[PDB]
Amino acid sequence: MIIPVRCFTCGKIVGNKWEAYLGLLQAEYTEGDALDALGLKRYCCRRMLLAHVDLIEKLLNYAPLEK
Amino acid sequence: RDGKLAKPRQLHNTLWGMVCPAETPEGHAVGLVKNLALMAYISVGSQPS
Amino acid sequence: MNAPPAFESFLLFEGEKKITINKDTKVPNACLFTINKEDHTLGNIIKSQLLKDPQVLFAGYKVPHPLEHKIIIRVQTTPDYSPQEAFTNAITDLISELSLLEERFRVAIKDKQEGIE
Amino acid sequence: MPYANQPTVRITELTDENVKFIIENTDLAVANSIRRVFIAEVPIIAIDWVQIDANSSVLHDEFIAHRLGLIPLISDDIVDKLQYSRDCTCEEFCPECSVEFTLDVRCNEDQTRHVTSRDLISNSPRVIPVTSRNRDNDPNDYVEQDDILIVKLRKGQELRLRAYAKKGFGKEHAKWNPTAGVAFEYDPDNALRHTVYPKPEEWPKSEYSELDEDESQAPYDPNGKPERFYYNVESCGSLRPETIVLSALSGLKKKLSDLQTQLSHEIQSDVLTIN
Amino acid sequence: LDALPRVTCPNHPDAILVEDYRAGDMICPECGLVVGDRVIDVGSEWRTFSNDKATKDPSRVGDSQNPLLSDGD
Amino acid sequence: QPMIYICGECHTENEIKSRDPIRCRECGYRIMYKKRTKRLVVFDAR
Amino acid sequence: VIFNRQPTLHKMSMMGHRVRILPWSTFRLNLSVTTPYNADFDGDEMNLHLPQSLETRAEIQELAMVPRMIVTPQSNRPVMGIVQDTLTAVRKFTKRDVFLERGEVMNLLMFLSTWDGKVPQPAILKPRPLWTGKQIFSLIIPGHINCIRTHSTHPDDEDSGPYKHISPGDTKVVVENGELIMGILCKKSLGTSAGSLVHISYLEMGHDITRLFYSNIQTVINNWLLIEGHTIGIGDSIADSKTYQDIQNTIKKAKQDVIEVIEKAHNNELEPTPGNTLRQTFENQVNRILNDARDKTGSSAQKSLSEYNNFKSMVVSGAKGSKINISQVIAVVGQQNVEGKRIPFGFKHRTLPHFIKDDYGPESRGFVENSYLAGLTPTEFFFHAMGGREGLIDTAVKTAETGY
Amino acid sequence: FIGKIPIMLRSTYCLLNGLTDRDLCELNECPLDPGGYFIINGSEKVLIA
Amino acid sequence: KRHIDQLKEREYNNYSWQDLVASGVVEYIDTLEEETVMLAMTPDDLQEKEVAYCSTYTHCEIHPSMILGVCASIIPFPDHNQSPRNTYQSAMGKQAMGVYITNFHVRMDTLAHVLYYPQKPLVTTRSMEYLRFRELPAGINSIVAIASYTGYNQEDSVIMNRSAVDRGFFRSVFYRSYKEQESKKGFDQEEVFEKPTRETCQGMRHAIYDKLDDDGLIAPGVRVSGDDVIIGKTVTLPENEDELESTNRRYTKRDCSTFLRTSETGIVDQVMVTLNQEGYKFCKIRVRSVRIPQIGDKFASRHGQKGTCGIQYRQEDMPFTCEGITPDIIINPHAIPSRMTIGHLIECLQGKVSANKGEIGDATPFNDAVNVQKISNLLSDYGYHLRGNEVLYNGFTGRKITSQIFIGPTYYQRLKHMVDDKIHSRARGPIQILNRQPMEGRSRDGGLRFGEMERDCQIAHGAAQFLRERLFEASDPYQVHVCNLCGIMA
Amino acid sequence: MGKRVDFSARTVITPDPNLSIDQVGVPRSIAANMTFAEIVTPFNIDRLQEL
RNA sequence: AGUCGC
Ligand SMILES: [Mg+2]
Ligand SMILES: [Mg+2]
Ligand SMILES: [Zn+2]
Ligand SMILES: [Zn+2]
Ligand SMILES: [Zn+2]
Ligand SMILES: [Zn+2]
Ligand SMILES: [Zn+2]
């Protein structure tokens, strides 16, 4: 689905770092470093962004966003 | 079905890479319902001619 | 569904009262305070302020059941000094420590810092 | 009273994002309860009623309501001017106890649109908006500050709704956490032996253990007590970190003073017959 | 008692008789009422197959044979 | 008057509010998803 | 109400309880009655019946009610004793090295039920106040319940060491006048063993005060547990270089000795044991070697465990799992077997196509060298699944037959 | 015409067998759906080996 | 390796697995033939060989972990687990919920559970790539501690971080589709979809017909509940055969409308009207419901540890560490040793290192990686205790916990079977007419069976009045007159 | 010899250490749906009248 | 029926 606002574990807001993240992977592939530049030090916030799958982009392709 | 202990329930030696070792129900049907291995394939049949 | 509304965790009920005091009969000069709609945040601190007091013989609190917002405090003092007064004083004393902590904190923030507001 | 400590404070380091400090000459329960207050008892403003006019998005209604419920609100302006829904005399909501937002967007373009909190707007004056550039063309710009991403949309989809944020605190729902993180630590050389290391050499020394600066590792002291508590309050940005601490101390004072008044009311109103 | 394919409120002549299916009782709206001999609808009742097997229907003590085409099955 | 029914694909109103066959006019589909109530329904964010 | 479960294997499976209303949607049960119902909370449903008269309410209260279902006539020992996590926390708590400050004792006292209200004098007055663990436990033990012995855990010695004059080796559990004098409590004292402490409370002071005693003990020990903690991590699964070399070296000795028995058999130098055939003798002999290897190495692994280890504390307390589990986790999984014997030649004279025809050597036919920590090699893995299946099937077949 | 035989889903006789990711997303069928099972009176019916 | 370079080339070339078979470098082997081959486990072993074992091999394994079937491949380090432990996971993994196909928003499946924020596992097996399991995840990476904390979690239950379930952890949407047909059906009797009225129909259960639209069926977005009647079907039936003014009222038609008896709360998601294969006006209506993880819902790690959520605590009371990263689940330490599911423990340590490094972790069973010591070593380089533990503070009194707790990520599953569906009670319900005894399933709101075996137990109790109450006065009590002169009831 | 009964209930079970050994915690929905038939006396009449 | 729960 979409990225959950605010990491489950601790509470730090995180949806805001998603779009910035995909730009980093196109740049510096060092996923550790990319996560680091976004400021997600502690690993629960890091798993949050690290493990997510952005399923919405597939979902958007169904013709009828009308139903 | 329902009252009959047997050896066609126990994983057999030949099921090596043919049928998943540990993917059969935990109920009374245990070991009778098996699950195909990942690499396993099944012959579709052909004329011997 | 059977889950309480989450605000019911801390709002006092209209037929309830915040604290209740009952005597213990097992030993002389002792009391049992019931604090309703409160938790470890309150219960644990009041225990420590009372134990600081040297006239207090015993002090302890227990949350009777986790699903149930309520704590009990048992306190026992010397015959020469009512246990109720120690409790009232223990809060006031605690109120005073937090007030001094707040004044020192604001002043410490007031120390040559920038972006303090 | 002739046994109350002197609980002293010291700020180490401060930013707009976090505030890190050390408290000395206090009890652990004080150190502890204050921590539980930073999480639960600091009140704040977050969306609490969502009414949806139209939802043609590729997402179900409650899902939009939920994600929206977590959007951080700049309560830098004192939430104290604004009351609680229950104490406030008015029927339902009102301008004095509630804050009104509207979101109305649709994807007419042949390009995937992203819906973000900047699209949500305060009917209320700009003292309580979403955390997105309402106060910062920050010379320290991060070419985004999109605050958050509510949903994604393709051509022909629409989303129209209104929402009423309220003051409430962390004890009732997690959306009202003022904290992003709240570190707490004490006795970092394990002197008091409150934890026992088997093979004590395998553990890494903390950032405050640098006392002995020696590899001698954890000297014992049996007469000791807990002192010197280290904190690191980190804010999600919905409230200035310094302000979170100060409001917490006040809320706990208001809460204690109320218990004292209630207890006084026990002997003042309907006199106690304990003796 | 022959005079009630469904009227039987002793105190006042019936107005309507409502069926409280889950409690299994027949209730009379303007008093208390319980005139029961409960039967939510005997066609729902035969559905006493569940954890027991069903789509060979051992509980099939009654075929239907679609009689409304014929003169009588 | 349930005179709405968004279509199978053309999404035009069916307009049927009677007993006539549910064939969408202009558009061949006869699967008719039903439009939302004007009714207001609140969701708490919790 | 009476509450129960199916299958109702025996009278203790269905008993009277008092309702206590709570939020959310499930039946809550005092952890200690889990065993007579044989429930878990791994997802098990339970059913409740509410009697409908005063005669049946009287009949349940007087006959079926749980403090009265304690000592079963099924085998005149208690049906229920202290279980799970609390039992490990009681072991950990009664050790002679546990000491408490005035604050922790007051907190535990506060959780007790029948507490007279008089804080006992700490076993250490100076230099600072300290209460010992056994001491606080003595407030829980009813009026004057008094056991003996029941030390019989791994500790102390296998009967002759303690007679070497009794040098307080600390294991022996002595209680007098209802006050715990010495020694750690465990499955042997508190468990459902015929000679146990819980048995003496029931038998001595009556059913009700024993009922409050179960409640009382579980609650006090669980709070102490909260400050103490308990865990398990890979730290518990690791020994040392020296143990691990010796483990490998001992398996190397056993494997080489099997090859010696195979060579003796192929040379036809071997002779049968009386009453048996040559294959049975060969098989009896190799089986004796691989088990003996396994037990020697297991006993080595038991010897290497440090006393701080969480894993050793659960087995020694008698909470869950046994000494053999520690062996398998730390040293070697050991022999696999179906219907008793080693893995059959399911192929033509082989076990897997990976092996050569006729390979009685321990690996091609059963026996796994690795531990659960090291991981099982592919073949080792599959042969293990054969041995695990026997256990799954037997559960289903046995369940039907006993039922009948 | 002699009768109607059920088609197994996404086999070469299904309509789905040639289409790319784009056409299948267009048709409203998930590209990731494995297929291989019949559709009978609106029910997915899979045969068991 | 030249064949490999063509396989890399496939990204823009016609070369394929069939070409690979055409090189004759791979063969297909049935179980009868597999008996007569000499089969090397791995290229490594076939290489080192000199006098090590034999040299007559004829085939070799393309990868040994392939012996697993579809569900067994999800479970990471399956070889560090006790074998039946793997079998319970293969059942439960198949049992979990998540997203089950992408186009699910337009499918009218009878019953579905969709998770909000599924994540791809931090620890993975290489096979999982071939399952598109990266596309359709089944669960979430929890931060887990194996501790005892409050004893709520004994005997296979778990303590959960309630703020984590609040910030949206493991939330799900649930859908049920109710379906109804307007059959022309009978000779003269007829069905119509329309809003019933107490003036002119037979039936009229006390349940509310007012939510029905004038069309005869409700509409999307309206909140529904336990007694709501969602579709208004009616059956005109008596034609008028009861000759002569059987009028009064409610005589034209009986009611049989379709109403909620399974989804005791929710919203109407969709209402869909069409005509089915028979050509009758036909309907499907879907209701979405949202399940919050609660005391009684059931979860499992991937190594067959299922357990119930035994309580939930605020993020204040969870134990916390250093930064204060409080665990979302605490699974009880007594669960591991007796079940020996050691692989679950490697997954935390593998999981901690992957999340922390930022690289997703390999857990494919058979490799040369010696994976326990080397994962531990990486973790120490990052700065934690080299073997995983952490010093966690007591969440209540803020104190430090005497020992350390083992904590880190693990993929967890919320399983289909959830408390709110199973709960049941009866207090005088409907009665079946073959026995005049209570109903059997909840589908008919039934009672429970006081079985042959439960009966036997009460005898052993000697509670005869209660045995008599339950097998008689509580279910089916009846009064009969018998003749005295002859024992026959007649 | 074994029939279905009325006044019966079933749910998933979960552990509660703060519970006495012969208590069982029971959900509100089951407590409100289940009933017990009390008989009215000349003294508890006032309490039942309250209920 | 089968699937499935313990
Ligand atoms: Mg058990
Ligand atoms: Mg169980
Ligand atoms: Zn976080
Ligand atoms: Zn107002
Ligand atoms: Zn009436
Ligand atoms: Zn159309
Ligand atoms: Zn007669």
Side-chain angles (χ1 to χ4, degrees), chain B residues 11-30:
Chain B
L11 184 69
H12 186 287
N13 305 61
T14 43
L15 299 203
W16 170 267
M18 291 296 177
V19 148
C20 180
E23 191 165 351
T24 57
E26 71 193 332
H28 61 67
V30 50

Side-chain angles (χ1 to χ4, degrees), chain A residues 21 24 28-39 46, chain I residues 357-358:
Chain A
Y21 181 71
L24 291 185
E28 323 159 327
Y29 61 93
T30 44
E31 288 201 88
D33 192 15
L35 287 168
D36 215 358
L38 292 169
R46 206 186 287 241
Chain I
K357 175 174 190 195

Side-chain angles (χ1 to χ4, degrees), chain I residues 107-264:
Chain I
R107 282 170 52 99
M108 291 300 198
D109 304 346
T110 321
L111 197 171
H113 290 92
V114 187
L115 184 67
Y116 275 4
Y117 310 103
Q119 314 187 325
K120 60 181 170 184
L122 282 177
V123 185
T124 178
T125 82
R126 285 174 188 236
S127 306
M128 295 177 77
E129 178 61 4
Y130 314 132
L131 304 184
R132 300 294 172 164
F133 193 78
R134 299 191 303 165
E135 295 287 303
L136 303 163
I140 310 185
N141 300 271
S142 303
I143 292 306
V144 178
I146 322 183
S148 36
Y149 212 56
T150 49
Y152 272 69
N153 69 349
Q154 278 135 347
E155 281 309 342
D156 300 353
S157 56
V158 299
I159 297 151
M160 262 182 176
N161 189 319
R162 193 180 168 148
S163 301
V165 312
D166 276 10
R167 291 162 190 156
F169 189 62
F170 279 137
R171 279 160 186 267
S172 306
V173 59
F174 168 77
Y175 299 110
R176 184 172 292 117
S177 308
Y178 291 98
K179 59 176 186 269
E180 184 63 25
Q181 199 158 183
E182 190 189 18
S183 283
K184 182 60 174 73
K185 188 172 170 63
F187 174 83
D188 59 341
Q189 79 184 353
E190 170 169 4
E191 298 188 344
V192 178
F193 274 39
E194 61 178 357
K195 179 173 182 173
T197 177
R198 293 178 179 174
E199 303 296 324
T200 58
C201 73
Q202 178 184 338
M204 311 176 295
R205 298 166 320 97
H206 68 290
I208 305 307
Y209 296 147
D210 190 76
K211 285 176 186 187
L212 295 168
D213 196 356
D214 193 22
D215 187 31
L217 42 73
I218 38 72
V222 59
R223 184 170 283 115
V224 290
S225 62
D227 280 346
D228 292 330
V229 179
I230 46 178
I231 304 178
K233 203 173 73 167
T234 53
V235 61
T236 298
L237 168 65
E239 257 328 69
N240 202 22
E241 299 299 325
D242 199 66
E243 26 184 4
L244 247 338
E245 272 58 58
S246 309
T247 47
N248 193 335
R249 59 179 285 177
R250 69 190 292 281
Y251 175 82
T252 61
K253 63 191 179 179
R254 266 163 49 178
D255 174 85
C256 58
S257 58
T258 287
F259 59 98
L260 255 56
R261 343 130 217 163
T262 36
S263 299
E264 298 178 340

Side-chain angles (χ1 to χ4, degrees), chain I residues 339-481:
Chain I
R339 282 180 175 101
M340 300 178 285
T341 80
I342 303 304
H344 180 224
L345 314 183
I346 321 296
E347 182 165 347
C348 284
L349 192 87
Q350 178 59 273
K352 201 177 302 190
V353 161
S354 284
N356 206 93
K357 175 174 190 195
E359 190 181 336
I360 286 306
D362 180 8
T364 303
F366 314 124
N367 38 32
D368 64 332
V370 292
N371 247 49
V372 199
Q373 198 174 19
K374 283 192 191 263
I375 294 169
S376 304
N377 185 88
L378 278 160
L379 185 55
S380 52
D381 198 32
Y382 279 144
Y384 297 96
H385 171 255
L386 67 105
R387 280 193 186 88
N389 308 73
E390 275 171 21
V391 188
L392 261 62
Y393 294 127
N394 185 352
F396 303 127
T397 68
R399 190 173 197 266
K400 203 180 294 178
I401 300 293
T402 317
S403 61
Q404 308 72 347
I405 301 313
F406 184 82
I407 177 167
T410 323
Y411 199 76
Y412 261 70
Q413 304 156 123
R414 185 176 191 189
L415 305 193
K416 175 190 172 187
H417 169 84
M418 284 173 303
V419 62
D420 233 2
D421 296 340
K422 304 317 206 88
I423 58 190
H424 187 27
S425 68
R426 173 206 180 80
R428 289 189 195 89
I431 301 298
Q432 61 169 191
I433 45 84
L434 287 78
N435 298 268
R436 204 201 167 274
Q437 294 174 351
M439 285 299 143
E440 305 256 342
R442 293 165 76 219
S443 69
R444 282 6 249 200
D445 202 3
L448 291 75
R449 192 147 68 96
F450 192 93
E452 286 200 272
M453 190 71 264
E454 251 107 280
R455 175 214 83 138
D456 218 76
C457 181
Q458 294 304 105
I459 307 313
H461 281 300
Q465 300 170 116
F466 184 73
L467 170 78
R468 195 193 66 83
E469 194 203 342
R470 289 292 106 176
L471 300 186
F472 176 55
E473 286 158 312
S475 55
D476 167 50
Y478 187 41
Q479 68 295 340
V480 184
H481 303 269

Side-chain angles (χ1 to χ4, degrees), chain C residues 52-117:
Chain C
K52 217 172 75 187
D53 189 6
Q55 297 177 334
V56 159
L57 307 190
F58 179 83
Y61 81 125
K62 155 173 166 288
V63 191
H65 190 283
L67 300 180
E68 291 189 312
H69 311 74
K70 179 175 285 188
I71 65 177
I72 51 169
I73 307 176
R74 190 190 305 272
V75 56
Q76 183 185 48
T77 43
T78 54
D80 194 27
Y81 178 73
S82 175
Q84 196 177 320
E85 184 165 8
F87 191 100
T88 314
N89 185 246
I91 301 168
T92 300
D93 192 77
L94 179 64
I95 288 169
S96 304
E97 286 181 347
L98 288 170
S99 297
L100 186 54
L101 205 168
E102 187 207 312
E103 203 69 50
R104 284 176 160 153
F105 193 79
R106 58 175 66 256
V107 172
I109 286 292
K110 183 181 177 180
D111 185 15
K112 185 181 172 62
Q113 302 302 328
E114 291 188 349
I116 59 175
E117 298 186 350

Side-chain angles (χ1 to χ4, degrees), chain D residues 6-180:
Chain D
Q6 101 201 179
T8 54
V9 310
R10 287 194 270 176
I11 304 301
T12 308
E13 162 203 301
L14 174 64
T15 71
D16 199 13
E17 186 183 356
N18 87 302
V19 60
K20 187 183 191 174
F21 60 96
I22 310 178
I23 302 184
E24 290 176 309
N25 294 265
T26 185
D27 183 50
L28 173 62
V30 173
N32 178 55
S33 58
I34 286 171
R35 191 195 76 263
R36 293 174 61 94
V37 163
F38 298 128
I39 310 163
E41 301 295 0
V42 181
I44 204 169
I45 309 302
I47 305 296
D48 205 32
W49 292 121
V50 179
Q51 172 183 12
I52 304 186
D53 191 356
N55 172 27
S56 61
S57 82
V58 61
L59 221 65
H60 64 301
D61 288 35
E62 290 157 339
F63 205 80
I64 300 172
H66 179 53
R67 296 181 82 270
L68 186 51
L70 291 167
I71 295 187
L73 290 187
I74 307 183
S75 294
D76 194 28
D77 154 88
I78 51 165
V79 305
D80 199 52
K81 296 188 308 188
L82 189 137
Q83 294 295 333
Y84 286 99
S85 180
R86 305 169 298 253
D87 317 342
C88 188
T89 184
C90 80
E91 192 189 348
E92 299 300 326
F93 60 87
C94 102
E96 303 291 336
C97 72
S98 310
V99 174
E100 184 170 358
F101 293 88
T102 30
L103 169 63
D104 172 43
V105 73
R106 65 183 65 245
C107 192
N108 75 329
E109 186 61 25
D110 285 330
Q111 186 178 352
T112 297
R113 186 171 182 173
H114 296 247
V115 172
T116 77
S117 63
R118 304 184 298 179
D119 295 337
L120 186 82
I121 59 168
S122 302
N123 188 347
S124 302
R126 189 179 287 175
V127 294
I128 184 55
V130 286
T131 326
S132 52
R133 300 177 61 78
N134 283 290
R135 62 170 185 92
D136 44 353
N137 49 107
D138 194 17
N140 190 222
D141 183 69
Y142 307 91
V143 303
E144 194 63 22
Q145 290 102 342
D146 65 332
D147 190 59
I148 186 55
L149 167 82
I150 286 169
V151 76
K152 300 187 180 183
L153 301 179
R154 199 177 272 189
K155 185 179 182 182
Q157 303 174 303
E158 67 182 279
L159 179 61
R160 182 179 284 201
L161 62 79
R162 62 176 73 253
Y164 296 137
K166 283 188 293 159
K167 189 169 73 183
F169 41 71
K171 181 163 280 182
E172 188 179 331
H173 196 278
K175 67 190 166 176
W176 289 292
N177 264 145
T179 45

Side-chain angles (χ1 to χ4, degrees), chain G residues 5 38-44:
Chain G
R5 197 188 169 205
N38 282 306
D40 315 322
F41 305 101
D42 71 324
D44 287 341

